[PDB]
């Protein structure tokens with residue numbers, strides 16, 4: 012049992028954290044006050060769920076989590092909401108003044124004022140671990156805190172925990188819900204500076220999620236609450252191998268071995284199914300083959316891009332619920348005889364499969380139907396580079412005129428960091444090209 | 452073979468330490484470069500405003516030397 | 521969080537007073553400072569503009585300034601005149617005489633420290649000061665000259681805070697005073713260097729709206745100011761109510777100002793209907809939207825179709841379909857693509873606040889950073905150089921100690937601003 016610490020940074024990181032930790036509580040039978048009647052070992056234990064929850068002598072199960080934002084109003088709603096008793100007040104950390112959608116303020120001007128306190132509180136969580144496996148960092152690409160402060164924190168964590176593993180859940184911007192013209196700048200800056208401090212990063216495209224809410228759940232104008240409930244289901248599928256045990260369970264680190272062929276190639280595409288409303292799930296059993304096949308339809312991806320037009324380097328299927336290997340193997344044999352799955356030539360083509368038997372949960376008053384089985388596919392495809400190209404193009408359009416650059420220079424940044432970050436992104440796009448060329 | 456095993460593990464230790472060290476150093480140089488740049492930007496803003504003040508006192512004593520006629 | 525509000529001169533104080541009346545009604549504050557409202561959203565962000573005094577009383581964080589006592593005693597006798605902190609009235613008596621140099625260099629320079637004493641008292645009390653908004657005109661002498669002096673001094677003491685102005689631009693259609701082009705040009709020369717964002721409230725456009733669309737043959741300052749106050753309410757909704765977009769002055773500036781000198785905004789409001797058409801015209805999302813983007817609803821006398829938008833914020837208020845707002849805003853951009861610069865992607869942002877202004881079921885407020893604002897500055901520059909060419913009335917200003925060179929420099933700075941707006945209007949992505 013190796014503990015995982017979650018760090019939720021900025022509004023998007025915090026609000027997605029709210030949705031995730033509420034969902035985890037429901038999945039483990041933990042009440043809003045942290046009591047868990049089914050846990051008979053009081054004040055401690057080595058159970059699977061203890062990777063994410065520590066225990067007090069009073070029977071409280073406490074998330075191994077820190078929430079950090081440079082202004083107080085989002086975290087204040089945690090301090091005062093349904094799950095306020097779950098967290099010790101020192102896990103909820105706020106400044107007074109946010110980063111104003113400016114990476115420079117998140118990484119330097121405002122962030123430098125709070126980083127030592129944050130690392131101190133993280134240290135307090137790490138010291139309660141007997142075998143810390145690593146960190147999970149949640150943040151947006153687009154905000155000043157989510158970009159600048161997260162990059163600062165990732166650098167500092169590399170210094171204080173060596174090469175202890177760091178995974179990211181990264182919210183990639185969409186115009187339907189974006190708040191700042193400069194989000195392409197912040198995105199490229201944070202990607203450049205975090206690239207060598209991250210072991211594996213799950214990008215979540217707000218537009219992919221928004222379209223899935225509109226099309227599959229018939230929500231006419233999704234809010235962050237809609238987006239976040241769906242996101243938390245995907246995050247839950249990815250962490251379920253850490254929080255539950257079972258015979259056919261396969262640890263996330265074992266998928267990681269397959270998902271990262273070179274340190275910089277560490278951005279898996281996630282695809283989740285089934286996403287379906289109560290009204291349509293009624294009397295509609297969705298089988299193993301149906302949800303598996305749904306994994307290969309690009310409308311179900313969390314990042315908009317087209318794997319049909321790139322090459323695979325790995326394909327992983329994380330099943331949960333009522334699923335046995337014979338049905339998985341049959342569905343996979345079907346898909347391989349009919350779909351556009353081309354691997355690079357230097358990679359074996361077998362699909363790696365994990366099954367967790369605990370079935371998916373839904374939050375009361377959500378929009379997803381409660382289903383008997385779900386699957387999250389994690390694949391490593393060259394197509395994810397499309398998401399970089401789109402963002403790089405927006406960056407180029409503005410940077411050619413130095414639009415808004417004075418806001419960054421005023422906070423102490425230099426144009427050279429802009430061009431350095433943009434060159435790193437151009438080299439990343441080329442890396443994704445090179446891995447797809449055939450061997451000579 | 453034992454000597455090789457010792458060299459492999461000490462190489463791993465040395466690469467992790469050099470990574471920690473270079474991250475530490477480049478962070479500290481970035482923070483200092485940035486504090487200097489920001490302070491220089493503010494100091495130039497302030498110097499412009501203080502020159503405005505000197506021009507205002509110049510304008511007022513100009514008025515008082517032409518009200519001496 | 522906290523904004524400190526300053527109103528200077530006659531225009532400054534009259535439009536400031538109407539602003540405080542309108543937003544106090546919106547927030548459920550009565551003239552005694554007491555809250556009598558129905559929705560908790562009225563008090564969630566109330567401390568942005570109000571201090572909480574003993575007795576659960578809310579006091580505008582407002583500072584009232586003039587070199588004459590007249591307008592401010594009118595303020596004190598107004599409907600909400602009792603609401604203001606009495607120590608926050610800072611009037612002189614010599615007056616300014618519609619002379620920028622008097623307001624900036626001599627008489628106003630004598631009152632400025634006394635004003636700064638109240639700003640520090642108000643600022644020291646803030647948990648997290650955002651910055652400052654100043655209401656004033658650019659055509660008189662107190663508001664223009666002393667207002668820009670006060671901007672410079674505040675910036676010297678709070679260089680890392682945002683400086684925002686609501687600046688009323690002079691028009692021959694509304695005022696006779698012939699030195700207004702001088703005062704306006706010297707003001708603009710200051711604003712270009714020392715504010716982060718400026719709302720151009722153009723009296724020319726206010727008149728034209730009142731006369732042509734509202735059909736008031738004799739528009740009062742009272743009718744101009746109802747336009748101004750509805751606009752000011754609109755463009756501060758995002759600071760005053762819970763919301764995601766432009767929710768503070770720095771984030772608004774970061775979204776609106778791609779180049780530090782191009783920070784002059786063209787505001788707009790919808791709906792504006794004549795008594796005659798108010799029975800016919802339906803208040804739909806597609807028509808709020810199309811008005812909001814129309815030359816005739818701009819509070820600045822410029823045609824957006826004569827330049828290009830660098831950035832835009834649109835604020836819808838009232839109960840409406842957000843899906844429909846989304847579709848109409850996409851539709852405006854699609855059908856008018858050529859008028860938004862292609863090298864700033866996604867430069868139109870949209871907010872929706874549930875709480876409509878008083879007397880409407882839904883409204884729309886527009887803030888545009890458009891290279892067509894040069895039309896305004898050109899108009900002032902014309903009227904300036906027609907006088908300066910003949911050195912007309914220069915002696916009011918040399919009489920206070922200024923040289924010709926400051927006039928030349930202000931004219932050249934304003935011409936440079938116009939050139940820069942033109943440069944980015946001509947820029948191409950390729």
Ligand SMILES: C/C(=C\c1csc(C)n1)[C@@H]1C[C@@H]2O[C@]2(C)CCC[C@H](C)[C@H](O)[C@@H](C)C(=O)C(C)(C)[C@@H](O)CC(=O)N1
Nearest residue numbers: 734743744746747750791792793794795798801802803
């Ligand atoms: C009712 C309305 C729009 C509407 C509702 S439904 C529909 C189809 N249109 C706006 C309200 C809006 O507050 C403004 C911003 C203030 C308007 C006050 C103006 C400045 C003059 O002082 C005033 C004497 C007017 O001229 C009238 C005609 C009464 C006014 O009614 C015009 C108008 O456009 N008013």
Ligand SMILES: Nc1nc2c(ncn2[C@@H]2O[C@H](COP(=O)(O)OP(=O)(O)OP(=O)(O)O)[C@@H](O)[C@H]2O)c(=O)[nH]1
Nearest residue numbers: 021022023026109110111112151153154155156157
């Ligand atoms: N999916 C999702 N996206 C969000 C959420 N909140 C904000 N975003 C996205 O995050 C980006 C803006 O970043 P934020 O997280 O709000 O900003 P921040 O990290 O708090 O940084 P500052 O406010 O500038 O200090 C935009 O792309 C938003 O659409 C959320 O709850 N869920």
Ligand SMILES: Nc1nc2c(ncn2[C@@H]2O[C@H](COP(=O)(O)OP(=O)(O)O)[C@@H](O)[C@H]2O)c(=O)[nH]1
Nearest residue numbers: 529530531534657659660661662663690695741
């Ligand atoms: N919109 C509007 N403009 C005004 C008002 N009062 C004065 N002005 C304009 O302001 C300019 C005169 O400046 P004013 O504020 O009266 O001079 P000050 O007292 O020295 O600041 C002229 O162009 C007037 O048309 C007002 O209440 N509303």
Ligand SMILES: [Ca+2]
Nearest residue numbers: 050052055056
């Ligand atoms: Ca236990």
Ligand SMILES: [Mg+2]
Nearest residue numbers: 021022109156
């Ligand atoms: Mg934030």
Ligand SMILES: [Mg+2]
Nearest residue numbers: 530531618660
């Ligand atoms: Mg006057």
